[PDB]
């Protein structure tokens, strides 16, 4: 039984950042070389773990989070980082043990005139905790009253920093329990 990595990476539709998706991988063999040696990714940085040693490690759970953000927002998907995405949409903790993988999706997630299906959270009273999700819609708009979510300007003719990127984050969990996922 092989882990359904392709089912996550080769998906037709990704979730917006404020409402990021999560799936749990367990009870399977995890071949990570299919991701590490892939030329389709622009980003593949691991924290707390070496990307070439993954096939020799066993975990109790592997969690795959996915969302779409701008190119210039990719740097905020990391430990110790701050910003509108890091603080109000998707927060990672200081002692993360996982890998962040991202690639350009300009030819999938944009259209002439701009694709505004994806939106990001702009206003919040406070910052998010690690792996917290907030999809509330609380502000009538008016003077000093604003909608919490702001649409993205994903146009196909935008510069690289403003193009859409698909991001998948693989978090590695080790409990006081027998591992369920091992490499070859």
């Amino acid at each position: 039984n092989l882990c359904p990595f392709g089912e996550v990476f080769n998906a037709t539709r990704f979730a917006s950042v404020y409402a990021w998706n999560r799936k749990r991988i367990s009870n399977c063999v995890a071949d990570y070389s299919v991701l590490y040696n892939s030329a389709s990714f622009s980003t593949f940085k691991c924290y707390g773990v070496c990307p070439t040693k993954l096939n020799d490690l066993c975990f109790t759970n592997v969690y795959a989070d996915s969302f779409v953000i701008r190119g210039d927002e990719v740097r905020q998907i990391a430990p110790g980082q701050t910003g509108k995405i890091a603080d109000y949409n998707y927060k990672l903790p200081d002692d993360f043990t996982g890998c962040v993988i991202a690639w350009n999706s300009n030819n999938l997630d944009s259209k002439v005139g701009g694709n505004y299906n994806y939106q990001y959270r702009l206003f919040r009273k406070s910052n998010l905790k690690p792996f917290e999700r907030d999809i509330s819609t609380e502000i009538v708009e008016g003077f000093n009253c604003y909608s919490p979510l702001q649409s993205y300007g994903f146009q196909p003719t935008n510069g690289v920093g403003y193009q859409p990127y698909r991001v998948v984050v693989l978090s590695f969990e080790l409990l006081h329990a027998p591992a369920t996922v091992c490499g070859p």
Partner: antibody, heavy 126, light 106 residues
């Protein structure tokens, strides 16, 4: 390499059922779903349904609802489809193929198509 | 469900000539859900292009395609004796359906 193998031609009476097998090898069985498509003489490709080899979940075309049952046998890595209440309009060649349009575990939509098609099984109703 | 119509019905072309096959959807179809198939007489259908721009393993580089919105195209840069077959467009954005199919013959 990957190959899907089906049974030979069958002849059934009206009202009868037909069970068509599809033996699949050359890949991890539980990693890919199985799709079924039929082609009547002079016609194009008509989708009947889809089954996952991981959790047994199915998805059928409305046209065939209530008449088609799908199952899998992991130990022999073989899929099966049964078409019940055969009519004169059900004379066709029934094909199996390896699916990558729907996820086997979660049922998500994927970027892909049907491949490694079998030779097709001809079923005649008379 | 989304209806797929292909045109022209039948193409009459010599070997060595270029061919273009069109498929128009009644509804918008994402490129991620659009694929093309080829069927030779007496044989099962084969996947040529998946995702509307990516070709299946074993498919010659003379086969390509692209599209957006409701208009997708399959292009054969040069017709070989082995390229004369019935081609189909398929979508799985809503349920799963196939188009009528287009025949290319000498």
């Amino acid at each position: 390499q990957v190959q899907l193998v089906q049974s030979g031609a069958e002849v059934k009476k009206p009202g009868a059922s037909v069970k068509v097998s599809c033996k699949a090898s050359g890949y991890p069985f539980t990693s890919y779903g199985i799709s079924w498509v039929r082609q009547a003489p002079g016609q194009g490709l008509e989708w009947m349904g889809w089954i996952s080899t991981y959790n047994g979940n199915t998805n059928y075309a409305q046209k065939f609802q209530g008449r088609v049952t799908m199952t899998t046998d992991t130990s022999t890595t073989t899929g099966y489809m049964e078409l019940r209440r055969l009519r004169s309009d059900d004379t066709a060649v029934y094909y199996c193929a390896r699916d990558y349009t729907r996820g086997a575990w979660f049922g998500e939509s994927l970027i892909g198509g049907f491949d490694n098609w079998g030779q097709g099984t001809l079923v005649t109703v008379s | 469900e989304i209806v797929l119509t292909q045109s022209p019905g039948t193409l009459s072309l010599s070997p060595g000539e270029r061919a273009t096959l069109s498929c128009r959807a009644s509804q918008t179809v994402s490129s991620t859900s659009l694929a093309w198939y080829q069927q030779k007489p007496g044989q099962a259908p084969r996947l040529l292009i998946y995702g509307a721009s990516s070709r299946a393993t074993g498919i010659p580089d003379r086969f390509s395609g692209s599209g957006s919105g409701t208009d997708f195209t399959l292009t054969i840069s040069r017709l070989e004796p082995e390229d004369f077959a019935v081609y189909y467009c398929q979508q799985h954005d809503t349920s799963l359906t196939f188009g009528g199919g287009t025949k290319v013959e000498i």
